Design a protein around this ligand. Structure first.
Ligand SMILES: O=C([C@H]1CN(S(=O)(=O)c2ccc3cc(Cl)ccc3c2)CC(=O)N1CC1CCN(c2ccncc2)CC1)N1CCOCC1
Ligand SMILES: [Ca+2]
Lengths: 235, 51
């Protein structure tokens, strides 16, 4: 996360972190339930063996409320391909249940129509993670959040060197030095409504970090709802 | 009707029935007695910041 504020106690309870054997956070996730994590498909390429961590806000100080979970089954979307970055979505079935406590709680899954009509027509959304705070800097040590404006779908394409597909959507700023960055992938993009948060997107890609004329590209969660449900029943 | 007015005055999901609105909630919530508000069932309902 380049810029933006820090996630204060209890603010980003649905954040999940994928860690490699070196316990290095390399990607993000969104807690969907005591058993499931939502992430980006391309994140299952940035590591070999990995576990998902929750309840963490500072990767260097045992806050006590953290917890590590192993992966029983990872559900990648077949249609996903790295040459287009289309269908950048995956579901993770946890071996053991996530016990919800302070800093550890799930984000709601909205309904397709209401979501597209009310959630994304909103002014902004929130993205977060332990990713880099600059394009060349290092992986953040503290979990961060950032209010990113929804970006008109046209400009999105007009500014993109790559085809923004039906399963993606732009969010962020044109010049303002704020946007997600490396390591934030798979992380959550949530929209607030009457003090209740709903998953609306997965951190997918972008050309560099916070570049002028460039936007953050998120996976359109509303476009895989039924898919996400089919995965919850494991399939 | 008119889930477009102010989300039909619902707390979460709003639907229309040719003439009226029909509110509904996310998993873990139960529709209140006014058929509009949503109420949690556990101490950790989805989408709430554990402040
Ligand atoms: O350099 C890259 C990638 C990601 N990064 S990144 O800094 O980490 C990165 C990753 C995810 C983001 C998500 C949001 Cl929302 C906003 C900014 C982001 C920045 C930037 C980049 O330009 N690129 C190059 C590009 C390579 C090919 N792309 C497409 C897109 C559509 N169709 C085809 C190809 C997009 C990114 N690497 C090297 C380090 O390891 C990770 C991969
Ligand atoms: Ca910690």
């Amino acid at each position: 996360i380049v810029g933006g504020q820090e996630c204060k106690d209890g603010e980003c309870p649905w954040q999940a972190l994928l860690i490699n054997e070196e316990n290095e956070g390399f990607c993000g996730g969104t807690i969907l339930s005591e058993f499931y994590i939502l992430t980006a498909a391309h994140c299952l390429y940035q590591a070999k063996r990995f576990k998902v961590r929750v309840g963490d806000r500072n990767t260097e100080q045992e806050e006590g409320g953290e917890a590590v979970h192993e992966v029983e089954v990872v559900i990648k979307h077949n249609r996903f391909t790295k040459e287009t970055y289309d269908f950048d979505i995956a579901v993770l079935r946890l071996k053991t249940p996530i016990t919800f406590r302070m800093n550890v709680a799930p984000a709601c899954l909205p309904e397709r129509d209401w979501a597209e009509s009310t959630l994304m027509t909103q002014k902004t959304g929130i993205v977060s993670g332990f990713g880099r705070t600059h394009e060349k800097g290092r992986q953040s040590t503290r979990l961060k959040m950032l209010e990113v404006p929804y970006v008109d779908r046209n400009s999105c394409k007009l500014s993109s060197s790559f085809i923004i597909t039906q399963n993606m959507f732009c969010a962020g700023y044109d010049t303002k030095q704020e946007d997600a960055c490396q390591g934030d992938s798979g992380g959550p993009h949530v929209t607030r409504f009457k003090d209740t948060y709903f998953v609306t997107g997965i951190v997918s890609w972008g050309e560099g970090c916070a570049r002028k004329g460039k936007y953050g590209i998120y996976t359109k969660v509303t476009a895989f709802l039924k898919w996400i449900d089919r995965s919850m029943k494991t399939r | 009707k008119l889930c477009s007015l102010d989300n039909g005055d619902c707390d979460q999901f709003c639907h229309e029935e040719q003439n009226s609105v029909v509110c509904s909630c996310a998993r873990g919530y139960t529709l209140a007695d006014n058929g509009k508000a949503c109420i949690p069932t556990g101490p950790y309902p989805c989408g709430k910041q554990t402040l």
